[PDB]
Amino acid sequence: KKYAKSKYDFVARNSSELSVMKDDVLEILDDRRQWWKVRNASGDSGFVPNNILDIMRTPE
Amino acid sequence: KKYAKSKYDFVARNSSELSVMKDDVLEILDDRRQWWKVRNASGDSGFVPNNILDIMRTPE
């Protein structure tokens, strides 16, 4: 299993965020995958893997 | 304001995840989220920003 040690304190915001403490020892789930906090058209925010998307841009 | 389109679908297993449909346009909260799914020494599970998380590893 994976293990990371919190360097600082982290106050969760939403029920999907885990509030940790400095020196807290966490277990990395989902093979260290990387997620992003997103907001859908509906409004509800959430967590989605960054793996699944392609960025968008508008040349002004 | 950041935006990205979902290349694929993503079914959220639990409740701490955001389900997304193919070709779904999502807004990017912060741009460098890069969140991991971690687990508490209490059993709790959620999302935490990796920049404050130090990977534990065997010495050398």
From Swiss-Prot, chains A, B:
Disruption phenotype: No visible phenotype. Defects in PDGF-induced membrane ruffling due to defects in Ras to Rac signals. Dendritic cells are impaired in directional and chemotactic migration and are delayed in reaching the draining lymph node in vivo after inflammatory challenge. Mice show short stereocilia. Expressed in neuronal cell body and neurites, and prominently enriched in the axonal growth cone. Expressed at the tips of cochlear hair cells stereocilia. It comes from the Eukaryota. This is Epidermal growth factor receptor kinase substrate 8. Residues 1-58 form the SH3 domain. It is found in: Cytoplasm, Cell cortex; Cell projection, Ruffle membrane; Cell projection, Growth cone; Cell projection, Stereocilium. Ubiquitinated by the SCF(FBXW5) E3 ubiquitin-protein ligase complex during G2 phase, leading to its transient degradation and subsequent cell shape changes required to allow mitotic progression. Reappears at the midzone of dividing cells. Phosphorylated by several receptor tyrosine kinases. The effector region is required for activating the Rac-specific guanine nucleotide exchange factor (GEF) activity. It mediates both barbed-end actin capping and actin bundling activities. The capping activity is mediated by an amphipathic helix that binds within the hydrophobic pocket at the barbed ends of actin blocking further addition of actin monomers, while the bundling activity is mediated by a compact 4 helix bundle, which contacts 3 actin subunits along the filament. Homodimer. Part of a complex consisting of ABI1, EPS8 and SOS1. Interacts with BAIAP2. Interacts with SHB and LANCL1. Interacts with EGFR; mediates EPS8 phosphorylation. Interacts with MYO15A and WHRN. Belongs to the EPS8 family. Signaling adapter that controls various cellular protrusions by regulating actin cytoskeleton dynamics and architecture. Depending on its association with other signal transducers, can regulate different processes. Together with SOS1 and ABI1, forms a trimeric complex that participates in transduction of signals from Ras to Rac by activating the Rac-specific guanine nucleotide exchange factor (GEF) activity. Acts as a direct regulator of actin dynamics by binding actin filaments and has both barbed-end actin filament capping and actin bundling activities depending on the context.
